[PDB]
Amino acid sequence: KNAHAVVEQTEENVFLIPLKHLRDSQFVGTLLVGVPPQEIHPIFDTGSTNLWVVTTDCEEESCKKVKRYNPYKSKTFRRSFIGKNLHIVFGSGSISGSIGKETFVLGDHTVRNQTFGLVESESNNIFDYIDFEGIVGLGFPEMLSAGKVSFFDNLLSQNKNLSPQFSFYISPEDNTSTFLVGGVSKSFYEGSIYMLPVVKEYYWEVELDGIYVGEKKICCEEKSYAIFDTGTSYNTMPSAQMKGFFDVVPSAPCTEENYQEVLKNYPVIKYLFGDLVIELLPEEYMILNEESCIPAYMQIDVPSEKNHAYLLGSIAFMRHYYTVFVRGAGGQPSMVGVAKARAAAEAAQKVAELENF
Numbered sequence: 108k109n110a111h112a113v114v115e116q117t118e119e120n121v122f123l124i125p126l127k128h129l130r131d132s133q134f135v136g137t138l139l140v141g142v143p144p145q146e147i148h149p150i151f152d153t154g155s156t157n158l159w160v161v162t163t164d165c166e167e168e169s170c171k172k173v174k175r176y177n178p179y180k181s182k183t184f185r186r187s188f189i190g191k192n193l194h195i196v197f198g199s200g201s202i203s204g205s206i207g208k209e210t211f212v213l214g215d216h217t218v219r220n221q222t223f224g225l226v227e228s229e230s231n232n233i234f235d236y237i238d239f240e241g242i243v244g245l246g247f248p249e250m251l252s253a254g255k256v257s258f259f260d261n262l263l264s265q266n267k268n269l270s271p272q273f274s275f276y277i278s279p280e281d282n283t284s285t286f287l288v289g290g291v292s293k294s295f296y297e298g299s300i301y302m303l304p305v306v307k308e309y310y311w312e313v314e315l316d317g318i319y320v321g322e323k324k325i326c327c328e329e330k331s332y333a334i335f336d337t338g339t340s341y342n343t344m345p346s347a348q349m350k351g352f353f354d355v356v357p358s359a360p361c362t363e364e365n366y367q368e369v370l371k372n373y374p375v376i377k378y379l380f381g382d383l384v385i386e387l388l389p390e391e392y393m394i395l396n397e398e399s400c401i402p403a404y405m406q407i408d409v410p411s412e413k414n415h416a417y418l419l420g421s422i423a424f425m426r427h428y429y430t431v432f433v434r435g436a437g438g439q440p441s442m443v444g445v446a447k448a449r450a451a452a453e454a455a456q457k458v459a460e461l462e463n464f
């Protein structure tokens with residue numbers, strides 16, 4: 108019931124990371140590792156928390172094709188005397204490596220003593236189709252596989268000018284996509300921001316009360332949730348619902364010249380977050396793919412939350428909605444704020460942060 112305010116900040120307290128939309132579909136920024144600095148181009152992933160860097164310890168083909176980080180060239184790289192192995196399995200691949208500490212620079216801000224995973228193996232594969240160099244995880248610290256301090260938390264603890272919030276502006280056809288640390292920019296949205304409380308600090312997870320495709324109620328008979336996950340380009344539904352969705356949302360042949368008409372009669376999707384209703388128009392949740400219009404959706408069953416979790420991804424959701432991620436503390440819940448994205452945005456002219464009243 109207690110509101111947040113958008114307050115102005117000096118430009119250095121909200122730093123902007125340009126995100127380049129690569130042909131392999133990654134939105135990657137720039138990250139400097141160690142001294143002398145080595146440059147990598149990671150994705151920024153609200154669906155995980157570990158910091159991963161691809162290293163010269165991985166000699167596989169998928170790793171050798173990118174600019175591998177070499178820890179033996181870094182004066183600041185440190186291993187602990189007793190090492191730790193890390194092995195992550197997810198739907199489209201696996202990542203395994205060891206733990207180390209390093210100094211990072213993100214947006215001219217320095218972070219020391221940062222635990223990170225050194226990729227040694229990318230083989231279970233998604234890595235054969237992308238030029239993967241790393242992940243800056245932005246989930247809650249509960250998802251860390253190792254270390255006591257997440258990258259975001261550690262960055263904040265060493266840079267008192269930053270507020271514990273960040274936001275994403277996704278505009279791939281513009282080359283204006285931006286990851287913002289410490290606040291927001293009014294250049295990237297219009298209307299008001301509406302806040303949704305985070306119900307469990309693991310993923311960025313909020314209550315989801317219903318889903319409609321046209322007039323058909325696709326959700327919810329049981330208590331459901333939405334997860335804002337920049338690490339997936341697609342929106343997702345659980346299996347039970349995913350089949351029913353594609354049954355009423357078929358693909359269609361399309362070109363840049365006829366898709367507006369092809370899709371003119373497709374249904375509008377609505378997500379219900381309490382009194383907030385978010386709608387996705389056909390030209391927003393359908394994407395052009397190999398002479399075809401296809402729904403930017405995929406099936407995903409999240410074992411925690413009992414497969415009642417629905418993911419909101421970079422291309423089918425954040426492209427249309429500017430999203431803010433606000434880190435709660437103590438009795439104050441973390442929150443996600445959502446606003447209609449401003450399509451006319453160019454550069455972030457001014458910057459602000461959300462203050463809690």
Ligand SMILES: *[C@@H]1O[C@H](CO)[C@@H](O[C@@H]2O[C@H](CO)[C@@H](O[C@@H]3O[C@H](CO)[C@@H](O)[C@H](O)[C@@H]3O)[C@H](O)[C@H]2NC(C)=O)[C@H](O)[C@H]1NC(C)=O
Binds near residue numbers: 219220265
């Ligand atoms: C990165 O991690 C290192 C290792 O923990 C940090 O170095 C440590 O920093 C603390 C505080 O600056 C030092 O505390 C000192 O301990 C002596 C006793 O040895 C005490 O009498 C002093 O009053 C002082 O508080 C600690 O010695 C130091 N440890 C080492 C091995 O150098 C470092 O601060 C971390 N860097 C950042 C940016 O957080």
Ligand SMILES: CCC1(CC)CC(=O)N([C@@H]2CCOc3ccc(C(=O)N[C@H]4CC(C)(C)Oc5ccccc54)cc32)C(=N)N1
Binds near residue numbers: 195242339
């Ligand atoms: C980044 C992977 C992890 C953490 C290791 C693990 C993980 O599964 N997810 C989500 C959870 C929900 O289910 C899925 C399902 C699929 C994908 C996927 O294939 N993602 C692609 C996107 C692309 C090609 C742009 O970049 C990369 C870059 C690297 C790896 C994967 C991708 C992601 C998720 C994360 N959010 N993070």
